[PDB]
Amino acid sequence: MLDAFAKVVAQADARGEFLSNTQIDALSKMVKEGNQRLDIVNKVTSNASAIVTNSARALFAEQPQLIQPGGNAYTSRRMAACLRDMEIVLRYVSYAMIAGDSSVLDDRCLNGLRETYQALGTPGSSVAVAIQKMKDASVALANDTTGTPIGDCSSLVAELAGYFDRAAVSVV
Amino acid sequence: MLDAFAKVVAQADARGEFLSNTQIDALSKMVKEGNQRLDIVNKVTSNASAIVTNSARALFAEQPQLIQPGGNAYTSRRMAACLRDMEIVLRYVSYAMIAGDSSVLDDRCLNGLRETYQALGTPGSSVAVAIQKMKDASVALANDTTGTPIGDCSSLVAELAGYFDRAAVSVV
Amino acid sequence: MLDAFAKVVAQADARGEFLSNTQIDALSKMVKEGNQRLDIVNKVTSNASAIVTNSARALFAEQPQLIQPGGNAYTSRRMAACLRDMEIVLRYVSYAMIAGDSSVLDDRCLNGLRETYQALGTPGSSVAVAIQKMKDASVALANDTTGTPIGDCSSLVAELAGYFDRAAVSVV
Amino acid sequence: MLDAFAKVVAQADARGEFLSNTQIDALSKMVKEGNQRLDIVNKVTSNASAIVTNSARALFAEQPQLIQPGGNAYTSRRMAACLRDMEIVLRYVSYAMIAGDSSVLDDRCLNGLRETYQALGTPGSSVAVAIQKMKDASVALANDTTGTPIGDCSSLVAELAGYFDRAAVSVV
Amino acid sequence: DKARSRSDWGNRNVLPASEGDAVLGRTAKGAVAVPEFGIPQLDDPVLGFGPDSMVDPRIAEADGAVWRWDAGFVDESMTLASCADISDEAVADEAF
Amino acid sequence: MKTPITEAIATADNQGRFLSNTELQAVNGRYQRATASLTAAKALTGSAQRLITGAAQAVYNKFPYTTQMPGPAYASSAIGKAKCARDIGYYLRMVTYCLVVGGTGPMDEYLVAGLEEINRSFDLSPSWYIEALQYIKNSHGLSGQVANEANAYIDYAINTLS
Amino acid sequence: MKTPITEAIATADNQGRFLSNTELQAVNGRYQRATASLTAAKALTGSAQRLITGAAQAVYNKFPYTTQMPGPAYASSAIGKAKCARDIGYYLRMVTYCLVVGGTGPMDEYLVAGLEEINRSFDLSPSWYIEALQYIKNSHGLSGQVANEANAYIDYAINTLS
Amino acid sequence: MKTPITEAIATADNQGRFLSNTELQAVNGRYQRATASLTAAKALTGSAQRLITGAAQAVYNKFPYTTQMPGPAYASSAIGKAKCARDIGYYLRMVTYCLVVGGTGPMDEYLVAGLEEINRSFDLSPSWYIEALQYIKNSHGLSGQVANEANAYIDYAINTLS
Amino acid sequence: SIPILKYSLSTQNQRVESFEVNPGDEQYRIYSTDSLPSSSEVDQIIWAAYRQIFSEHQILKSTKQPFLESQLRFNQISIKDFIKGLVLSAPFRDLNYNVNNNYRFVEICVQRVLGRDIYNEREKIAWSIIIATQGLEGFIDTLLNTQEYLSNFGDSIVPFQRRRIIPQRSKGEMPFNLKTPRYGIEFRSKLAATQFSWASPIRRFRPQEQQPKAGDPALFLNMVQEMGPGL
Ligand SMILES: *CC[C@H]1/C(=C/c2[nH]c(/C=C3N=C(/C=C4\NC(=O)C(CC)=C4C)C(C)=C\3CCC(=O)O)c(CCC(=O)O)c2C)NC(=O)[C@@H]1C
Ligand SMILES: *CC[C@H]1/C(=C/c2[nH]c(/C=C3N=C(/C=C4\NC(=O)C(CC)=C4C)C(C)=C\3CCC(=O)O)c(CCC(=O)O)c2C)NC(=O)[C@@H]1C
Ligand SMILES: *C[C@@H](*)[C@H]1/C(=C/c2[nH]c(/C=C3N=C(/C=C4\NC(=O)C(CC)=C4C)C(C)=C\3CCC(=O)O)c(CCC(=O)O)c2C)NC(=O)[C@@H]1C
Ligand SMILES: *[C@H](C)[C@H]1/C(=C/C2=NC(=C\c3[nH]c(C[C@H]4NC(=O)C(C=C)=C4C)c(C)c3CCC(=O)O)/C(CCC(=O)O)=C2C)NC(=O)[C@@H]1C
Ligand SMILES: *[C@H](C)[C@H]1/C(=C/C2=NC(=C\c3[nH]c(C[C@H]4NC(=O)C(C=C)=C4C)c(C)c3CCC(=O)O)/C(CCC(=O)O)=C2C)NC(=O)[C@@H]1C
Ligand SMILES: *[C@H](C)[C@H]1/C(=C/C2=NC(=C\c3[nH]c(C[C@H]4NC(=O)C(C=C)=C4C)c(C)c3CCC(=O)O)/C(CCC(=O)O)=C2C)NC(=O)[C@@H]1C
Ligand SMILES: *[C@H](C)[C@H]1/C(=C/C2=NC(=C\c3[nH]c(C[C@H]4NC(=O)C(C=C)=C4C)c(C)c3CCC(=O)O)/C(CCC(=O)O)=C2C)NC(=O)[C@@H]1C
Ligand SMILES: *[C@H](C)[C@H]1/C(=C/c2[nH]c(/C=C3N=C(/C=C4\NC(=O)C(CC)=C4C)C(C)=C\3CCC(=O)O)c(CCC(=O)O)c2C)NC(=O)[C@@H]1C
Ligand SMILES: *[C@H](C)[C@H]1/C(=C/c2[nH]c(/C=C3N=C(/C=C4\NC(=O)C(CC)=C4C)C(C)=C\3CCC(=O)O)c(CCC(=O)O)c2C)NC(=O)[C@@H]1C
Ligand SMILES: *[C@H](C)[C@H]1/C(=C/c2[nH]c(/C=C3N=C(/C=C4\NC(=O)C(CC)=C4C)C(C)=C\3CCC(=O)O)c(CCC(=O)O)c2C)NC(=O)[C@@H]1C
Ligand SMILES: CCC1=C(C)/C(=C/C2=NC(=C\c3[nH]c(/C=C4\NC(=O)[C@H](C)[C@H]4CC)c(C)c3CCC(=O)O)/C(CCC(=O)O)=C2C)NC1=O
């Protein structure tokens, strides 16, 4: 896996170059807003159980078909496996938020996942609905001003929204 | 794996339904012929070595090029692997006769066996001849009344002859 | 695996034959070459690190893109794994030289190597240039007369260079 | 494990010495004894099923309490292990004959065998009787001049008998 | 140039393409040339290597003709055995 | 699953062995018992609608806070009364599945496997379902060895929740 | 194959090594023995049918019930005598293969592997083939180191049947 | 150690085998070549001091910075010159141990296992030891198959350093 | 508690018997500490375990675990703990776990720890959720504690590719290191410093691969090296 800092290094090593001064300065801009990046994954982790179980409820209620007998998530095994798939994906989005890039999200979580759901018979479009229901649930928490100094985090929140969106198009 | 009774429950769970009265009485019909089904598998496994070594001896007299030099059952290891495979096929057929369905025979015996035999150069059409020789050596013995009370169990013999026919067409 | 005396036994058995006096007389012509065959694998084993590094040094002098940043033998772990491949191929050509035929080279080394290099992105046409430079380093060493009695081993030089040709067309 | 040539080398390295000419000339005498040593090992390995079976059958003739119901050779699974244990020891004595010293008999056969037999309840004194009946069955065979040049090899049969005494006092 | 040195076996030339181009003494692979046929044991129709005693599977691996990089390996994906018999009437009428 | 027939095949197949008389005596004990198990599965099915609503009303009397307290996990709304009741019908259906198969096979894959993650996530207390199952054990109306087979799989589901 | 050549390649390849002088000496010991070991295979092949029809008659002398008793397993028919002399020639041909290869390679692959399962199924007693190999062990007529090579593979076949 | 005798036992013990003719021929190849290698070990032992002082001087002519550069790794002091001629004697002694045993067994156990951590830590260069071993190869004065045996173990030590 | 999901078996060589008393040269060299090996022979157990778990190309000096080796030389850990300690090692996580997904990492560790191929594709799907929910330390413990490991290898044998060649044949199944390399066709593209994915054979104006013809004087050279004596 790579973070945002080692992404620039691995690209620079394939050209045999040192880093330019505008690449160090773009890296030190990530360090300047590093405290606001940590406040975002503090809000998401602390409510991570409530993000999964409220969006699945709007999901299980949202599509009645998933839990119907003969449906994919009917029985304890298929319904509890739907809950842990949401908790895996929500976990690997927060790994991509403190890293800075979506390299741990793509390698460890999204690689080969569309073809796995096709082999299982899992409706892949409905998994994208559950990821999008977790997207706005954690964006609404990220924009909460409780326990923080007031500032502008709007470019960081629009980056967290891009990690859930990448997970939702990589699964259908 | 599934047996016959667990196959009916798996049909009924996928529709979310209780079992009907006619599905209960169809299950109590299989209980009634349970002693005639146990009497067949006892008749077959008690003669299991003689079914194999006589159906093989009739095969090499009918297709004599299998024991000539270069033939597929010519050496002592190739001869002993032939008698191994007939004993494996007859073992899982005996498993499928007490269960009531061919779920253990398809999954644990036949899955990938045709592609195994093509890669070896083993003539798959000759393996089907030796299974049909084991079929009517077992059916003729299951119709033998020496030791059983007199009665008609011809539906069970037409079921046992279908497991042998299933493995015969799934090997070529 | 087969050696050269076991290749004639497997052809003979496949037709259920004895070995004629013409075939035995051709196997004692293979025994009389026995000490010259052992000198050839001794000269390849004793100089085995100068075969590999002199011909790797030659490989990057005339294809200098392989060790530039972004190349495949760049970043010294991939440089060390590149020299490992040349010692591996030289090991199995040495095995096929005492055996008298290339069957241990065929399935333990070359089986699946062309498809391995395509999954790694390694230029398989440049691995064949690496094998071809060890080919004439090993031939010039086996034509070299130092440490050997007078006599003849020139049909064996042409045989050693044929295993290097076998290894080089299987990778392109 | 060691042979006799590496026994004298492990003792010279521990004092940092070259081998003296007396130790070299005592080793080349062991080399010219080498064809007579391979005759003794060939004479045992070609009669190995009759050394085991006769000295077993002569053991349960004079000790019928072993195979009487309740004995430690009754119930053929225990009879198959008594014949395995006789074959193992005769195997590892013939291994220590080509080596020249009993370092392969000591570790991978005899280390922990009195401890094993005392754990199971095997009468270890009866095992020593059976080992001394394969001793004089194979001392008698190595003194047989059938198909050998008549020379003198009395010093290697006194060596082979010593490896049988080594295994017999090690289980009591 | 024509293989003249034993020193250019590693430099220029590779190995004989056909077995009629082999070294003086050996086969195309380089091993010694031995006659293929020995004395048949048990000449007999029912028990013996008759004309229709099926081929050894270990005759190719022992040859080294199963491995694709070897020259003996012939691929039968493009040969006449892989073409459909047109005299079969199930295949003609469907393809009409 | 966990039929006695599949639990006899699985021991013979592990050794790579044929079916001896050890296995045929095991399957014969299934057939000598199934005349009571199939009369219990038909008697629970024909009295299911009385048993579901009676067991669902019993947990409202024992725990009256479910019909009053707000939140999606309680039976205070018309959407909620159904889930607790549906679980009651889901528990009774796997009981009658386990009677026609013999042994706790169907309710393992369909009800027990992953049950602890469902009750933890959606905040459903397992003591609500124990009160419902104790109603069915009291008043299924059966007697003799018919009621012994029904209470054997009721108490298996209680032992997994407790 | 249990050739001394393929056993040398295997010990080097177990530890990923080049062929040192440990393994070239094992190959050299095969070449020093290959002179006597190849004149034995030439003389056993030339007296093949003399030794095969002689050894078949020695089994019918020691075991005369094998020509009288009815059944498929015995040499009491014209087909049973053809299949009996087929099997003597099988054991003789594998011995000569081991003499041209060096070491008990062909006998282990083509003959010994699976022999015990065959001789149990078709009711072929292994004492017949021991008597047939003891005839060839006494009647091949060779001497010196050429008989010493030949008898080492007759004796290896007897130890597998015994 | 890896000797030709312990590599024939280990391949027969792995197969659960008695010592066949595959293994007797391999031990016989050791006994044939042991006449040429026991005179190479006798001739290298008796001329050892001529070879040690010669081979240490051959390093000093080729890499003369090792006598001039100050520091504990170099042969610039009298202490560091006796530690060099010590090490040349260690390499020559292991070569004679491999000639009496047959096979690169003594130096695989006493010398090469852990050698790279010694040269890295104490800053010793493996090209100093290649130059010393290339002197001994060219100056041992052997000829025939006696020089063939000695040079095959010199070149094993060079290939582990190169 | 989420059991593993059920998959179907497939016909393989190791599921069925080879009737092979007296194995040959393709028997695959049991490395065990039950034979009481000395110091020179416990080095060979360690190299065989490195070759099996890592590649031959990952037996570099920077990869070797010197402290896991010394606990095996003192009889503190078994060979099953050496094999577990190599999978949870820092070189294996860096060079193998980071450049595969969860499905191709299962088939590497099935092929190299259990010594057999996967049964089907659903077996990769069934085991890849043991990694994602419990980690590598939980996945390798539930894989070494199967009955497939404890019956074949026990706790004192190095694993090997079980039953690769059939006793008559010369061409056996592909070795598991050539069949499954470090990374595959995904992660090849640009995540592993790669360009252009293929290459034509090298062209040259001196041809270097001319096949000899039937009258060429090097086919008769044949005595070439040295003339015979006598009269
Ligand atoms: C009389 C039978 C015919 C015949 C058989 C034959 N088969 C083989 C080899 C194999 N058979 C299997 C079969 C199975 N493996 C399994 O796991 C299962 C249960 C799921 C089965 C049924 C396998 C894996 C092999 C290959 C490995 C091995 O041989 O052990 C052989 C082997 C010899 C050969 O070279 O083919 C024979 C002779 N051949 C015939 O001619 C008969 C028609
Ligand atoms: C100078 C050589 C060229 C080159 C080589 C290169 N190869 C690799 C990686 C592998 N090579 C193999 C090959 C074998 N493995 C075997 O077991 C055998 C038979 C015993 C052979 C022939 C395999 C399996 C791999 C990949 C597995 C691994 O590395 O662990 C690499 C490194 C690839 C990487 O980045 O990890 C290199 C660099 N590359 C070149 O550019 C040269 C032309
Ligand atoms: C040719 C002389 C060159 C040289 C030699 C030099 N060596 C050392 C130190 C050591 N050498 C060893 C090597 C071994 N020890 C062994 O037991 C074995 C196997 C039998 C080998 C190969 C070791 C362990 C040391 C360090 C401990 C010691 O012996 O004192 C030194 C001293 C280095 C120091 O820092 O003290 C020298 C000078 N160096 C040269 O310059 C010569 C070219
Ligand atoms: C962005 C979505 C928020 C917001 C964030 C800001 N936080 C600022 C400083 C700050 N952030 C944290 C949380 C975080 N930093 C840590 O070190 C750790 C734990 C290791 C965590 C969880 C802390 C503790 C601080 C205090 C340090 C400081 O005062 O700088 C911050 C800058 C402060 C400022 O602008 O005055 C911002 C903007 N603010 C928002 O309005 C949205 C809601
Ligand atoms: C049909 C193919 C047969 C045949 C079968 C019948 N068997 C009958 C009764 C019966 N069979 C057994 C054997 C079996 N049952 C077991 O429990 C065990 C092992 C523990 C075995 C091996 C038993 C014990 C019984 C007694 C039960 C009884 O008396 O019914 C039977 C009677 C009627 C029926 O069961 O429906 C029949 C018809 N009889 C035949 O004529 C053919 C050959
Ligand atoms: C061929 C490319 C060489 C060459 C080879 C010759 N070697 C001859 C005899 C010979 N070679 C060895 C060493 C070899 N045998 C072994 O057992 C081992 C391993 C321990 C090795 C390396 C020995 C011992 C002998 C002596 C055999 C004898 O005395 O006959 C040789 C002799 C002529 C012949 O056998 O007809 C030749 C031609 N000589 C060359 O000129 C090229 C360069
Ligand atoms: C000793 C207890 C025996 C006995 C041994 C003798 N053998 C003598 C010579 C000899 N033996 C062999 C066969 C051997 N060498 C091999 O390489 C192999 C396997 C491949 C075997 C079985 C050969 C080839 C030779 C000739 C070489 C030589 O002379 O060393 C021998 C010398 C005669 C004498 O001086 O008496 C003896 C003593 N002979 C016996 O009488 C007892 C029974
Ligand atoms: C829930 C929102 C949806 C749903 C889920 C569902 N998933 C499965 C099964 C699996 N899911 C995975 C997922 C992953 N594996 C990984 O390794 C990673 C990281 C790369 C992820 C994200 C896997 C491997 C499986 C199969 C393993 C298993 O069977 O447990 C199921 C299947 C349960 C079953 O019994 O078949 C279900 C139902 N399905 C839905 O309906 C929701 C839309
Ligand atoms: C026979 C002449 C005497 C005899 C033998 C006997 N031995 C056993 C059991 C074991 N023997 C061993 C010994 C070894 N196993 C090995 O792998 C090796 C090589 C290192 C040796 C030396 C072991 C471990 C056992 C126990 C395992 C097993 O049961 O096979 C038995 C069986 C004892 C039992 O009750 O199981 C017998 C009968 N016993 C006699 O009475 C003879 C005097
Ligand atoms: C003759 C000495 C005695 C005898 C022979 C006999 N043998 C058979 C049947 C078989 N023999 C074999 C043996 C081999 N097959 C091999 O491929 C090899 C290695 C190359 C060997 C050793 C086998 C496999 C059979 C069965 C198949 C076949 O017909 O060949 C029979 C027929 C028995 C039957 O039931 O068909 C007979 C009569 N029997 C005697 O009485 C003689 C004393
Ligand atoms: C076959 C195995 C199986 C079981 C057992 C199961 C349990 C189960 N019960 C659930 C919900 C629930 N279960 C209950 C049940 C109750 N809570 C109360 O207040 C009462 C005391 C009690 C009624 C007896 C309730 C109230 C919910 C809330 C579901 C929601 O609102 O989303 C859910 C969440 C999804 C849903 O069904 O809506 C599951 C999976 N589902 C299965 O597939």
mmCIF file of C-alpha atoms in Angstrom, chain G:
data_model
loop_
_atom_site.group_PDB
_atom_site.id
_atom_site.type_symbol
_atom_site.label_atom_id
_atom_site.label_comp_id
_atom_site.label_asym_id
_atom_site.label_seq_id
_atom_site.Cartn_x
_atom_site.Cartn_y
_atom_site.Cartn_z
ATOM 1 C CA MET G 1 13.052 -43.958 -12.599
ATOM 2 C CA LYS G 2 15.539 -45.275 -10.040
ATOM 3 C CA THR G 3 18.523 -44.878 -12.335
ATOM 4 C CA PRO G 4 21.763 -43.743 -10.640
ATOM 5 C CA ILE G 5 21.652 -40.755 -13.004
ATOM 6 C CA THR G 6 18.184 -39.527 -12.046
ATOM 7 C CA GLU G 7 18.931 -40.150 -8.391
ATOM 8 C CA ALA G 8 21.936 -37.846 -8.691
ATOM 9 C CA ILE G 9 19.947 -35.026 -10.320
ATOM 10 C CA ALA G 10 17.331 -35.342 -7.591
ATOM 11 C CA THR G 11 19.752 -34.901 -4.686
ATOM 12 C CA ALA G 12 21.232 -31.821 -6.314
ATOM 13 C CA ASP G 13 17.824 -30.336 -7.108
ATOM 14 C CA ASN G 14 16.510 -30.963 -3.592
ATOM 15 C CA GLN G 15 18.748 -28.163 -2.323
ATOM 16 C CA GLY G 16 18.831 -26.086 -5.517
ATOM 17 C CA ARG G 17 22.451 -26.786 -6.367
ATOM 18 C CA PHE G 18 24.764 -27.426 -9.264
ATOM 19 C CA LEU G 19 26.113 -30.931 -9.771
ATOM 20 C CA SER G 20 29.250 -31.230 -7.680
ATOM 21 C CA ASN G 21 31.616 -34.200 -7.483
ATOM 22 C CA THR G 22 29.248 -35.874 -5.013
ATOM 23 C CA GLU G 23 26.857 -36.552 -7.872
ATOM 24 C CA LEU G 24 29.359 -37.102 -10.670
ATOM 25 C CA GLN G 25 30.805 -40.027 -8.730
ATOM 26 C CA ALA G 26 27.390 -41.681 -8.547
ATOM 27 C CA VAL G 27 27.156 -41.362 -12.325
ATOM 28 C CA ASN G 28 30.690 -42.720 -12.715
ATOM 29 C CA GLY G 29 29.889 -45.801 -10.651
ATOM 30 C CA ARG G 30 27.055 -46.557 -13.045
ATOM 31 C CA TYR G 31 29.466 -46.484 -15.989
ATOM 32 C CA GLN G 32 31.988 -48.798 -14.335
ATOM 33 C CA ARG G 33 29.242 -51.352 -13.692
ATOM 34 C CA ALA G 34 27.491 -50.941 -17.060
ATOM 35 C CA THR G 35 29.835 -53.355 -18.849
ATOM 36 C CA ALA G 36 28.895 -56.468 -16.871
ATOM 37 C CA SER G 37 25.321 -55.240 -16.505
ATOM 38 C CA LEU G 38 24.826 -55.033 -20.286
ATOM 39 C CA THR G 39 26.241 -58.441 -21.174
ATOM 40 C CA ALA G 40 23.743 -59.922 -18.737
ATOM 41 C CA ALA G 41 20.827 -58.274 -20.524
ATOM 42 C CA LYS G 42 22.065 -59.521 -23.886
ATOM 43 C CA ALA G 43 22.298 -63.131 -22.702
ATOM 44 C CA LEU G 44 18.965 -63.148 -20.866
ATOM 45 C CA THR G 45 17.188 -61.744 -23.921
ATOM 46 C CA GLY G 46 18.736 -64.335 -26.227
ATOM 47 C CA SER G 47 17.575 -67.167 -23.972
ATOM 48 C CA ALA G 48 14.163 -65.604 -23.353
ATOM 49 C CA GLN G 49 11.810 -68.233 -24.739
ATOM 50 C CA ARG G 50 13.933 -71.058 -23.346
ATOM 51 C CA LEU G 51 13.680 -69.581 -19.854
ATOM 52 C CA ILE G 52 9.997 -68.665 -20.164
ATOM 53 C CA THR G 53 8.691 -72.063 -21.240
ATOM 54 C CA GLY G 54 11.003 -73.726 -18.738
ATOM 55 C CA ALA G 55 9.868 -71.628 -15.804
ATOM 56 C CA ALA G 56 6.220 -72.153 -16.675
ATOM 57 C CA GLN G 57 6.767 -75.916 -16.546
ATOM 58 C CA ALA G 58 8.463 -75.628 -13.153
ATOM 59 C CA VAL G 59 5.369 -73.964 -11.702
ATOM 60 C CA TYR G 60 3.135 -76.724 -13.064
ATOM 61 C CA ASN G 61 5.451 -79.285 -11.455
ATOM 62 C CA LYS G 62 5.515 -77.769 -7.967
ATOM 63 C CA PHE G 63 1.867 -76.655 -8.130
ATOM 64 C CA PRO G 64 0.025 -79.311 -10.160
ATOM 65 C CA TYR G 65 -3.349 -78.113 -8.855
ATOM 66 C CA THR G 66 -2.989 -75.033 -11.065
ATOM 67 C CA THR G 67 -3.560 -77.168 -14.171
ATOM 68 C CA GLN G 68 -6.483 -79.198 -12.781
ATOM 69 C CA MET G 69 -8.680 -76.906 -10.697
ATOM 70 C CA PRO G 70 -11.479 -75.169 -12.619
ATOM 71 C CA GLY G 71 -11.929 -71.450 -12.497
ATOM 72 C CA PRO G 72 -10.640 -68.315 -14.183
ATOM 73 C CA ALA G 73 -7.645 -67.810 -11.892
ATOM 74 C CA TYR G 74 -5.890 -71.060 -12.824
ATOM 75 C CA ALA G 75 -3.943 -72.372 -15.804
ATOM 76 C CA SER G 76 -6.434 -75.150 -16.432
ATOM 77 C CA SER G 77 -7.446 -73.924 -19.890
ATOM 78 C CA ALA G 78 -5.717 -72.907 -23.095
ATOM 79 C CA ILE G 79 -6.246 -69.241 -22.219
ATOM 80 C CA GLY G 80 -4.932 -69.749 -18.689
ATOM 81 C CA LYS G 81 -1.708 -71.220 -20.023
ATOM 82 C CA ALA G 82 -1.288 -68.338 -22.463
ATOM 83 C CA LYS G 83 -1.787 -65.815 -19.668
ATOM 84 C CA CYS G 84 0.578 -67.735 -17.411
ATOM 85 C CA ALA G 85 3.499 -67.666 -19.832
ATOM 86 C CA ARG G 86 2.632 -64.030 -20.468
ATOM 87 C CA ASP G 87 3.350 -63.304 -16.815
ATOM 88 C CA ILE G 88 6.652 -65.197 -16.716
ATOM 89 C CA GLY G 89 7.801 -63.112 -19.658
ATOM 90 C CA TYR G 90 6.658 -59.959 -17.898
ATOM 91 C CA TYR G 91 8.915 -60.662 -14.913
ATOM 92 C CA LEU G 92 11.783 -61.608 -17.201
ATOM 93 C CA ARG G 93 11.448 -58.514 -19.387
ATOM 94 C CA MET G 94 11.466 -56.148 -16.399
ATOM 95 C CA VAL G 95 14.683 -57.742 -15.113
ATOM 96 C CA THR G 96 16.424 -57.060 -18.421
ATOM 97 C CA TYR G 97 15.155 -53.468 -18.391
ATOM 98 C CA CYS G 98 16.770 -52.979 -14.984
ATOM 99 C CA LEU G 99 20.047 -54.322 -16.369
ATOM 100 C CA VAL G 100 20.179 -51.855 -19.277
ATOM 101 C CA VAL G 101 19.190 -48.925 -17.037
ATOM 102 C CA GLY G 102 21.121 -49.651 -13.868
ATOM 103 C CA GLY G 103 19.117 -49.856 -10.694
ATOM 104 C CA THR G 104 15.581 -50.996 -10.006
ATOM 105 C CA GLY G 105 13.779 -48.339 -12.004
ATOM 106 C CA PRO G 106 11.526 -50.152 -14.492
ATOM 107 C CA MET G 107 10.586 -52.916 -12.069
ATOM 108 C CA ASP G 108 9.209 -50.435 -9.536
ATOM 109 C CA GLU G 109 7.117 -48.469 -12.036
ATOM 110 C CA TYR G 110 5.870 -51.182 -14.366
ATOM 111 C CA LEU G 111 5.769 -54.235 -12.110
ATOM 112 C CA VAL G 112 5.930 -53.778 -8.342
ATOM 113 C CA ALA G 113 3.655 -50.737 -7.922
ATOM 114 C CA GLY G 114 0.147 -52.092 -7.495
ATOM 115 C CA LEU G 115 1.170 -55.756 -7.668
ATOM 116 C CA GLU G 116 -0.206 -56.599 -4.223
ATOM 117 C CA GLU G 117 -3.636 -55.201 -5.111
ATOM 118 C CA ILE G 118 -3.753 -57.199 -8.349
ATOM 119 C CA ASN G 119 -2.672 -60.482 -6.786
ATOM 120 C CA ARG G 120 -5.417 -60.159 -4.178
ATOM 121 C CA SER G 121 -8.228 -59.298 -6.586
ATOM 122 C CA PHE G 122 -7.638 -61.894 -9.296
ATOM 123 C CA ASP G 123 -6.666 -64.520 -6.676
ATOM 124 C CA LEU G 124 -3.168 -64.962 -8.087
ATOM 125 C CA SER G 125 -0.952 -66.517 -5.465
ATOM 126 C CA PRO G 126 2.495 -64.868 -5.255
ATOM 127 C CA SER G 127 4.164 -68.190 -4.461
ATOM 128 C CA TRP G 128 3.800 -69.237 -8.106
ATOM 129 C CA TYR G 129 5.898 -66.338 -9.342
ATOM 130 C CA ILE G 130 8.545 -66.923 -6.673
ATOM 131 C CA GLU G 131 8.981 -70.479 -7.965
ATOM 132 C CA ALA G 132 9.201 -69.149 -11.515
ATOM 133 C CA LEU G 133 11.897 -66.649 -10.596
ATOM 134 C CA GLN G 134 13.893 -69.247 -8.659
ATOM 135 C CA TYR G 135 14.065 -71.325 -11.846
ATOM 136 C CA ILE G 136 15.510 -68.436 -13.881
ATOM 137 C CA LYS G 137 17.879 -67.701 -10.990
ATOM 138 C CA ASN G 138 19.332 -71.205 -11.336
ATOM 139 C CA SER G 139 19.139 -71.726 -15.094
ATOM 140 C CA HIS G 140 20.386 -68.566 -16.787
ATOM 141 C CA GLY G 141 23.868 -70.072 -16.949
ATOM 142 C CA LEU G 142 25.870 -66.900 -16.347
ATOM 143 C CA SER G 143 28.863 -66.596 -14.037
ATOM 144 C CA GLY G 144 31.238 -64.091 -12.510
ATOM 145 C CA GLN G 145 30.103 -60.495 -12.131
ATOM 146 C CA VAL G 146 27.572 -61.033 -14.921
ATOM 147 C CA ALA G 147 25.561 -63.486 -12.824
ATOM 148 C CA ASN G 148 26.116 -61.265 -9.801
ATOM 149 C CA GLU G 149 24.331 -58.460 -11.652
ATOM 150 C CA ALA G 150 21.572 -60.731 -12.923
ATOM 151 C CA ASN G 151 20.730 -62.366 -9.595
ATOM 152 C CA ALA G 152 20.511 -59.000 -7.821
ATOM 153 C CA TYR G 153 17.352 -58.258 -9.819
ATOM 154 C CA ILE G 154 15.904 -61.746 -9.578
ATOM 155 C CA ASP G 155 16.351 -61.446 -5.816
ATOM 156 C CA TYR G 156 14.832 -57.970 -5.760
ATOM 157 C CA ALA G 157 11.716 -59.337 -7.442
ATOM 158 C CA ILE G 158 11.449 -62.201 -4.941
ATOM 159 C CA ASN G 159 11.635 -59.811 -1.968
ATOM 160 C CA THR G 160 8.673 -57.836 -3.292
ATOM 161 C CA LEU G 161 6.509 -60.928 -3.684
ATOM 162 C CA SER G 162 7.660 -62.278 -0.323
#
